[PDB]
Coordinates of C-alpha atoms in Angstrom, one line a residue:
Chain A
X1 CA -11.1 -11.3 4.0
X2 CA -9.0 -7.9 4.6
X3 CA -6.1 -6.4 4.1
X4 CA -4.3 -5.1 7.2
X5 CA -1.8 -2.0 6.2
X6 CA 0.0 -0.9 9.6
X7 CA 2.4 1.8 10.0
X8 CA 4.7 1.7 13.2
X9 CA 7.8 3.0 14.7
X10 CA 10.9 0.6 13.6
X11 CA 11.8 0.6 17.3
X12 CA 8.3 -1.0 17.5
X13 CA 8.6 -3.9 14.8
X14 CA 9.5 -7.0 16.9
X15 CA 7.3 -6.2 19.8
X16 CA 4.8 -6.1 17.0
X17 CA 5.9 -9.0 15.3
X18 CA 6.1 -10.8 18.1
X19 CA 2.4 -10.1 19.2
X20 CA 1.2 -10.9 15.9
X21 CA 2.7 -14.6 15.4
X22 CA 1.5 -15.2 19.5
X23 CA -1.9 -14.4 17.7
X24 CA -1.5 -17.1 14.9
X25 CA -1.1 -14.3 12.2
X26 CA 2.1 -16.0 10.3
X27 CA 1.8 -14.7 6.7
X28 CA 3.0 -11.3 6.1
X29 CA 5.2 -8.6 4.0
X30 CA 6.9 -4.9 5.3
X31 CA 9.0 -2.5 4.0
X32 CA 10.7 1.0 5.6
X33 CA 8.7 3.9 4.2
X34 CA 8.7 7.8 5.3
X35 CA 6.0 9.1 6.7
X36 CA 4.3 11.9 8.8
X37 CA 1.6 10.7 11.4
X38 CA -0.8 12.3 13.5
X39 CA -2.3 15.6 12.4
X40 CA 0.8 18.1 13.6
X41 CA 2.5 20.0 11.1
X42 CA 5.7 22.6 12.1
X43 CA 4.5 26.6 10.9
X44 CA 7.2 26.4 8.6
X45 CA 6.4 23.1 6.5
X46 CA 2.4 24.7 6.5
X47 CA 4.1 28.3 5.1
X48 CA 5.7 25.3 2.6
X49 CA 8.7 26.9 2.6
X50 CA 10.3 23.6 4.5
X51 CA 9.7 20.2 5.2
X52 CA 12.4 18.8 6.9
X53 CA 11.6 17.4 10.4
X54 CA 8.7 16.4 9.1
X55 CA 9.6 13.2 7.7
X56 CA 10.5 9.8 9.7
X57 CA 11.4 6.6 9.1
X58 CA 8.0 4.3 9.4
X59 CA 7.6 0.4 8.6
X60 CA 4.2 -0.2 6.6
X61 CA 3.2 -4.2 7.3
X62 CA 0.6 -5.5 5.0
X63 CA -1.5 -8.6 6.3
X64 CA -3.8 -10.8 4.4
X65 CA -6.4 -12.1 6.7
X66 CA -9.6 -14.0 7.4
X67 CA -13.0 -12.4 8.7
X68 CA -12.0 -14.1 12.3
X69 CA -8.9 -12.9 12.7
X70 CA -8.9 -9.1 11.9
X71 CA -9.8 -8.0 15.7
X72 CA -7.1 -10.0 16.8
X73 CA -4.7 -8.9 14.3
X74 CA -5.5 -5.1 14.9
X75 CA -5.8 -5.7 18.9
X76 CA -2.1 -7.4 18.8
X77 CA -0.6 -4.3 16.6
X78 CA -2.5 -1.7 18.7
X79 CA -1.0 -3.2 21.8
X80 CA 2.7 -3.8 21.3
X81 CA 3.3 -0.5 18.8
X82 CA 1.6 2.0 21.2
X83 CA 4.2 4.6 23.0
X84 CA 1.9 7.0 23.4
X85 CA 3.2 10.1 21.8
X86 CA 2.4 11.3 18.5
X87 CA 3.6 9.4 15.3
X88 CA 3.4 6.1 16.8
X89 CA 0.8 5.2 13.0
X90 CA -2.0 3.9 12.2
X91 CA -4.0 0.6 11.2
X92 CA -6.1 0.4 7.6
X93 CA -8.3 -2.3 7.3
X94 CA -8.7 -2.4 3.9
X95 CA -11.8 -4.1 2.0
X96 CA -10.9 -7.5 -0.3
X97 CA -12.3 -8.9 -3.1
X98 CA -10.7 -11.9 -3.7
X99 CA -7.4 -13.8 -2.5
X100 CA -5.7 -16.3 -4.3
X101 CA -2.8 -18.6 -2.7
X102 CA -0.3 -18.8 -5.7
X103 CA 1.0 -22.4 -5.2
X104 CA -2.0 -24.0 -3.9
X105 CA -4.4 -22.1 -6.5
X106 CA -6.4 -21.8 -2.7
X107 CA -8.9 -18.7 -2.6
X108 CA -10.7 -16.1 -0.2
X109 CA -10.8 -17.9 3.6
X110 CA -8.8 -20.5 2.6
X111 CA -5.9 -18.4 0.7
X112 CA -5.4 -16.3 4.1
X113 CA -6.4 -18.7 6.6
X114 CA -3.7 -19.7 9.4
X115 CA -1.7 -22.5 8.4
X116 CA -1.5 -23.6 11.8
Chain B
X1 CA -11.3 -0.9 -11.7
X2 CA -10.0 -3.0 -9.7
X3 CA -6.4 -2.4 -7.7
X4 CA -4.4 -5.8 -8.0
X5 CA -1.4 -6.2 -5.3
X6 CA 0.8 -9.8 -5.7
X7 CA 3.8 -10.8 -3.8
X8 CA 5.9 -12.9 -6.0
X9 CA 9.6 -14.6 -5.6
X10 CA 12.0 -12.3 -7.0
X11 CA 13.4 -15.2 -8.9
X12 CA 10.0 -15.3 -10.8
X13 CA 9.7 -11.4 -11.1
X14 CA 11.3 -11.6 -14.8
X15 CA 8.7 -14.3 -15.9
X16 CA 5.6 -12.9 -13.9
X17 CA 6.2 -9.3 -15.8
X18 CA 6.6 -10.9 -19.0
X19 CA 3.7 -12.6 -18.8
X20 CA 2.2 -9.5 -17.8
X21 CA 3.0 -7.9 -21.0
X22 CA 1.9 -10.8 -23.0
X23 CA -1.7 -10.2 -21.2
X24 CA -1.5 -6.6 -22.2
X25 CA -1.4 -5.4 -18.9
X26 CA 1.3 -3.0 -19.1
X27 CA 1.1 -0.1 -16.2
X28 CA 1.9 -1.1 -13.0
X29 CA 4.4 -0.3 -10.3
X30 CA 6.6 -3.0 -7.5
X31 CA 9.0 -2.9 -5.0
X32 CA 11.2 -5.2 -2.7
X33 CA 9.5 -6.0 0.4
X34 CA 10.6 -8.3 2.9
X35 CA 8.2 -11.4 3.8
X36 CA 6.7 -14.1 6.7
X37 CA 12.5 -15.9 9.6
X38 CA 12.0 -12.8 6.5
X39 CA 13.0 -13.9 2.7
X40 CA 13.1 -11.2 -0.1
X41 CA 9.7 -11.2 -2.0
X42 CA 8.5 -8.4 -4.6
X43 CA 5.3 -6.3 -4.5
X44 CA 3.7 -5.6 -7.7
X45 CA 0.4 -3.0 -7.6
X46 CA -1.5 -3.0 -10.8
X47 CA -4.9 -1.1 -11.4
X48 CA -6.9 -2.6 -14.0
X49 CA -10.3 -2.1 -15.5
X50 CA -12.4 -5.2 -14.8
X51 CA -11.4 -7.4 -18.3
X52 CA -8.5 -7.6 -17.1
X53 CA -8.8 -8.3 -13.8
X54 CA -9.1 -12.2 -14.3
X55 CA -5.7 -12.5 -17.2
X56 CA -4.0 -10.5 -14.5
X57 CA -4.4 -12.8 -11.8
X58 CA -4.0 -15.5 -13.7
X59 CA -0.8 -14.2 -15.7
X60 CA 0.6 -14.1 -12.1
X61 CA -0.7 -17.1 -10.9
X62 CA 1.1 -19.6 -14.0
X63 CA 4.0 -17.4 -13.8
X64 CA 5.0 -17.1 -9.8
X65 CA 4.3 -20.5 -9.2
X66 CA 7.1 -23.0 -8.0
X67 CA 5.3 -25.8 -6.0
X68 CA 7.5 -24.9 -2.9
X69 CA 6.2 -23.3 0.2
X70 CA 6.3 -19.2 0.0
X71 CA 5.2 -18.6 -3.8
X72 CA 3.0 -15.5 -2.6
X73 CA -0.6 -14.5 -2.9
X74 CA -2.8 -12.0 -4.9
X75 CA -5.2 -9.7 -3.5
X76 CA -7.8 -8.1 -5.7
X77 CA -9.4 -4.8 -4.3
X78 CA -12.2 -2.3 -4.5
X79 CA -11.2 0.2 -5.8
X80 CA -13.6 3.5 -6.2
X81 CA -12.2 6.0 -8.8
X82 CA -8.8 6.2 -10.6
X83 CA -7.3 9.4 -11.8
X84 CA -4.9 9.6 -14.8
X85 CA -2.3 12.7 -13.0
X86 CA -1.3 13.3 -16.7
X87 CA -5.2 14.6 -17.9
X88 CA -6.5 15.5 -14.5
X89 CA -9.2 13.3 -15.0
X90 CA -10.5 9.7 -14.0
X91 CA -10.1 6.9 -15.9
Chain C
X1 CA -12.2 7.1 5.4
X2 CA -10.0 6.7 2.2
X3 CA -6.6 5.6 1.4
X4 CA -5.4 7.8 -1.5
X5 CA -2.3 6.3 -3.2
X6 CA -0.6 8.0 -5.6
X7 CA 2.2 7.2 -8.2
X8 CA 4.0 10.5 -9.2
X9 CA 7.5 11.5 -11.0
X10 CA 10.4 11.8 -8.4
X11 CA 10.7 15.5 -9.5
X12 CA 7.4 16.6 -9.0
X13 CA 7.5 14.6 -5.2
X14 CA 8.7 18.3 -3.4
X15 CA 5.5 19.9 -5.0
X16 CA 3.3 17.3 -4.5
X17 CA 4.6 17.2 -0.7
X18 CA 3.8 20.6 -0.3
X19 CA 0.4 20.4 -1.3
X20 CA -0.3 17.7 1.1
X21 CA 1.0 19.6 4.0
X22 CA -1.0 22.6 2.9
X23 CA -4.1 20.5 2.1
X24 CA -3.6 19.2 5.3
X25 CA -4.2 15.2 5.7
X26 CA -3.9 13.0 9.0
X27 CA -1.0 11.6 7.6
X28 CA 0.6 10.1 5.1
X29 CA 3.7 7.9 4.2
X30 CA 5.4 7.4 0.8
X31 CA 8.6 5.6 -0.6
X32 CA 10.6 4.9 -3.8
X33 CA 9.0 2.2 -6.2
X34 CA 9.8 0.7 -9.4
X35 CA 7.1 1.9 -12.6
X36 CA 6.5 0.0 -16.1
X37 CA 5.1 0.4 -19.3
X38 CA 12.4 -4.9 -19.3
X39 CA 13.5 -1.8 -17.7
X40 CA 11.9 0.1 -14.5
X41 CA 11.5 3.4 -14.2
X42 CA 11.2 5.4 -10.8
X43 CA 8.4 6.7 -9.3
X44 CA 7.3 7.6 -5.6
X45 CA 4.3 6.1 -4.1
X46 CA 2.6 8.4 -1.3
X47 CA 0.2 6.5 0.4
X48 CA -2.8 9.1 2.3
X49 CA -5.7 8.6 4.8
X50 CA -8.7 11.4 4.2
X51 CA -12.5 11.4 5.4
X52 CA -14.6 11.8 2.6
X53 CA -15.1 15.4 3.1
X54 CA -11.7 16.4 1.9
X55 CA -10.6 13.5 -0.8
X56 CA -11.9 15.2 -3.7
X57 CA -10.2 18.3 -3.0
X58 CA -6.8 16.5 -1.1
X59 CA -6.6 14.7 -4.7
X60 CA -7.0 17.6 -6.7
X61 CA -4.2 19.3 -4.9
X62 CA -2.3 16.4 -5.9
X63 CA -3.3 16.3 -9.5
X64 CA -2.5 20.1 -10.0
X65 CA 1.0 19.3 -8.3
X66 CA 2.2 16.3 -10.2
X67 CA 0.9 16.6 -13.8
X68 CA 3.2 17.9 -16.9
X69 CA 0.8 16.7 -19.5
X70 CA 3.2 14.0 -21.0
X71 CA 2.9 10.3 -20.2
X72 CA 4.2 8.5 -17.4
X73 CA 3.0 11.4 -14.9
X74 CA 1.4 8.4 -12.7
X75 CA -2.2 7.9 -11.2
X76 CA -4.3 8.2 -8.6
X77 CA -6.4 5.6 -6.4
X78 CA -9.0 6.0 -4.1
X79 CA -9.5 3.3 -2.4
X80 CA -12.6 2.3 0.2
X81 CA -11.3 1.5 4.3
X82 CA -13.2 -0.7 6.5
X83 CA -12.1 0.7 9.6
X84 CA -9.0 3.1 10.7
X85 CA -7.6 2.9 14.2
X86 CA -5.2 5.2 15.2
X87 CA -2.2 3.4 17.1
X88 CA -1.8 6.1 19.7
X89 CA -5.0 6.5 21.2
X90 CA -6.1 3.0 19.8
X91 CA -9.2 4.6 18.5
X92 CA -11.5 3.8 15.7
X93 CA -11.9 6.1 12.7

């Protein structure tokens, strides 16, 4: 199992949304966050004297899912939330213990595993 | 360690962080996220040293449950050092 | 690569920001959160991805940023990453 964390552009969330259900990737949470991608920085937020501009509205998903269906699941975000210019985010696949479904008690594979 | 992130109904927040408490497990941190159309669930991220990894997920598990489709889920992960910011040192 | 995540006081979020910028990471995002131990208490939640090279040193600069010494200043992880792709270029790592 892993856990998915993607960052993307809010303009990109149903494109990316839409991608990942198409890939039988249902289960899922996000949330807006700030953030600052790609490795750019204005002279005046390095001198720390500002950080303004430097800040944008991101939204983080976070994905639960089996061995099987992380290439899928990175290959549908990296498709749709692509612009190509810089602070379109970035994809963590994170490493994972253990999973448990909370009503079914279900664990690991079968906690994340599409329901259809 | 261990870093322990559920996704609860906020309907059973109250319960699951009692239960929490009753396990000792006291530090942790959550937020409103929006989950699967989208219904309001809540994060909760909890590092614990590895006792208490089991009566965390399992303080969780009795609490959040409803039977109905859309309790949540519990991940458990790695985790390879924790810093405690007020002593500038692991934990 | 590692995914720092820290927890850290609202007030000390301007000098922690600063020393990530100065640090220099390949990006980060963070957002308001509720901390405990009822009653919640706020707290910001920066999330950072750094290659091994630079983690110790990234989370020192945030450690000497957001620490007063009394408790409730937060904590650190450092977690382990499969794989990072970056969604512009679509590359791994």
């Amino acid at each position: 199992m892993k856990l998915i964390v993607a960052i993307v552009r809010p303009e990109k969330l149903n494109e990316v949304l839409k991608a990942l259900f198409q890939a039988e990737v249902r289960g899922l949470t996000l949330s807006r966050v700030q953030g600052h991608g790609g490795e750019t920085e204005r002279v005046e937020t390095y001198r720390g004297t500002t950080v303004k501009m430097e800040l944008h509205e991101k939204v983080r998903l976070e994905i639960g899912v089996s061995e099987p269906f992380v290439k899928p699941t990175v290959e549908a975000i990296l498709k749709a939330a692509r612009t190509g210019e810089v602070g379109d985010g970035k994809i963590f696949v994170l490493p994972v213990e253990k999973v448990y479904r909370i009503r079914t008690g279900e664990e690991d594979e079968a906690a994340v595993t599409p329901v259809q």
